[PDB]
From Swiss-Prot:
The lineage of its organism: Eukaryota, Fungi, Dikarya, Ascomycota, Saccharomycotina. The GPI-anchor is attached to the protein in the endoplasmic reticulum and serves to target the protein to the cell surface. There, the glucosamine-inositol phospholipid moiety is cleaved off and the GPI-modified mannoprotein is covalently attached via its lipidless GPI glycan remnant to the 1,6-beta-glucan of the outer cell wall layer. It comes from Candida albicans (strain SC5314 / ATCC MYA-2876). The chain holds residues 27 to 180 of 228 of the full protein. This is Cell surface Cu-only superoxide dismutase 5. Induction: Induced during yeast-to-hyphal transition and by osmotic and oxidative stresses. Expression is also increased when cells were grown on nonfermentable substrates as the only carbon source, in serum, and in the presence of neutrophils. Down-regulated by shikonin. Expression is controlled by EFG1, NRG1 and RIM101. The keyword Cytoplasm does not apply.
Length: 157
């Protein structure tokens, strides 16, 4: 039986933002994906910080505007009364905004997919972290977590 590969988004500190850390996505139990957030350097007083999967990659320029709109294949809404009514990539709307100067949390999401054949696939997309007023503060591409794959391989970074 096939299992889809884990993913990661690596945020780096630059003159544009002190936010740095990672969001890891790993297959979990009962058709869910475990999301592990580990971030520091957040500008707390302009949060709390929504964060979402966006539609386009972060380009080499690191312009978070270039990630364009939210990943929302099923046309969910920004506000809702049950998790499934939010966009697939609306992680903060379903699970909580990032908050504080540092934020470390783990949770399962039952909508994002690691499977490239799924309409809910998030590989190759991006994550944007926003100030509370919507300004995009930092962003990262969603890439493979492990260097080595296949049923005859090990991984050894
Ligand atoms: Cu966003």
């Amino acid at each position: 039986a096939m299992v889809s590969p884990s993913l990661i988004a690596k945020f780096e500190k630059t003159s544009k933002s002190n936010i740095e850390g990672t969001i890891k996505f790993t297959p979990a139990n009962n058709g869910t994906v475990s999301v592990s957030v580990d971030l520091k350097g957040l500008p707390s007083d302009i949060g709390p910080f929504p964060y979402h999967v966006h539609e386009k990659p972060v380009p080499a320029s690191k312009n978070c505007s270039a990630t364009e709109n939210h990943f929302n294949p099923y046309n969910g809404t920004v506000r809702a009364a049950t998790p499934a009514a939010h966009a697939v990539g609306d992680l903060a709307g379903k699970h909580g905004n990032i908050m504080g100067e540092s934020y470390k949390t783990e949770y399962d999401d039952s909508y994002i997919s690691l499977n490239e054949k799924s309409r809910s696939y998030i590989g190759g997309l991006s994550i944007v972290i926003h100030a509370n007023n919507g300004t995009r503060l930092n962003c990262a591409n969603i890439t493979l977590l492990d260097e080595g794959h296949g049923n005859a391989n090990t991984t050894m970074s």
